[PDB]
């Protein structure tokens, strides 16, 4: 599967984020070439192009495909030759001629990326080529890291090490800007596509879901390839929530069993707003309730009357409850208790009946779970349904979000499953009765403990908090950071406090806190466990694109991790500006 190859690529680079040994680097390269060029063929890059063409409904001309693939094969052979020379040098570092040899393969291979990258954004085809661009962009940035890791030991002088560093910094911004712009444009085009609005939303959401996995999930890694800002292993999380296709009847196409699309709202914004909850602090699904009733227009079958969703914020027990529909008239009920479980797979039966009225039915939903002890669990409800099976649609979540479990599966293993169930929304319906539910998933790199890792940079998103101030603090979308971010407007802060977060550690932790932030003006920030507040300067002008830098607290004196940590903005000494908080980074001090 191509989606599962993409999940694996992301996971591989996240697993090796920040590492800088030559032996491990060699293992990452060999691993990565097998993933991206299975059996030394371009099969995966063809699938990248074919899938994206299908998603955004634009083909690529054979002249451009053939040129992209031809550069991709040159890139494969140059990386092969580079890793091979990196290995020969690593096993005989004192050999001058082997230092020369790996230096030459490096600059020749890095020049190929410079020469080749434009072929992956051919004018008129930047859209359908986007995943090819993102993935090659990713390799280029990672290759450039090698110069900072090994350059001086190859005989590189500092100026040339410094040139590659600065080139990498520019490419991070170029490649990120390109991926975001064309992600948003494909979205924009799909949003304005002709057709039944329900199917227009579905195609729009499918692009968002797959391109999040293929492209956006790459973008948080790009700054981590900065080996000066990240000189050791760095632990990152993707907090973004994506939605699988709505669980509604399709594919039968008979007047009595139509596709659900015609029943959805005729307004795009209504579907989007009811299917896709607002950004918030990251949320763990702890319960689902379904209420359903039986109808007998001719066939007889249950339909949902309403449903409810319960979540908790990270390391908080307070419950967030979201209700949909109603329980009035329901005669059936099922509650899934999901606290402690990663639900890694779902199975559903979808049905519909259009006669005097138009019913949508999900009479069966089965969840597959695994808990922290690695014990598999299952739970389901099966409600009445006498519609012939060939008039129903069964679906496995793992067909959009693939898994690959071991015989003794392990909780938290992304090598096995990359996503966990997080939400149940619905399709805003224009007519009829019955819930068309939509399932929301979060990425398994998010961990439920907010653990600090000694010996590692722990990068914790601000949204891993459990509380924010009542005013002046908003949570907003961000395409390039792997999840949402905090937006602070200072004149609207009731007080200095921005958010609260609970951390997990065994022993007392000697920390520096580095915030990755953006701001339109100057001010002063503060964090629990760190004595001195830190003045920060503007990174951007109001309105323009967000531009991030870093702000370190604990440079005067190392702090100690508070289990209950708060970020503060000192209103009195902060300008009348906007501040964005992306990640919180706990840097270990010796």
TrEMBL record:
<feature type="domain" description="Pesticidal crystal protein">
    <location>
        <begin position="234"/>
        <end position="446"/>
    </location>
</feature>
<feature type="domain" description="Pesticidal crystal protein">
    <location>
        <begin position="22"/>
        <end position="226"/>
    </location>
</feature>
<keyword id="KW-0843">Virulence</keyword>
<dbReference type="GO" id="GO:0005102">
    <property type="term" value="F:signaling receptor binding"/>
</dbReference>
<comment type="similarity">
    <text>Belongs to the delta endotoxin family.</text>
</comment>
<keyword id="KW-0800">Toxin</keyword>
<keyword id="KW-0749">Sporulation</keyword>
<dbReference type="GO" id="GO:0090729">
    <property type="term" value="F:toxin activity"/>
</dbReference>
<dbReference type="GO" id="GO:0001907">
    <property type="term" value="P:symbiont-mediated killing of host cell"/>
</dbReference>
<protein>
    <recommendedName>
        <fullName>Crystaline entomocidal protoxin</fullName>
    </recommendedName>
</protein>
<dbReference type="GO" id="GO:0030435">
    <property type="term" value="P:sporulation resulting in formation of a cellular spore"/>
</dbReference>
<feature type="domain" description="Pesticidal crystal protein">
    <location>
        <begin position="457"/>
        <end position="589"/>
    </location>
</feature>
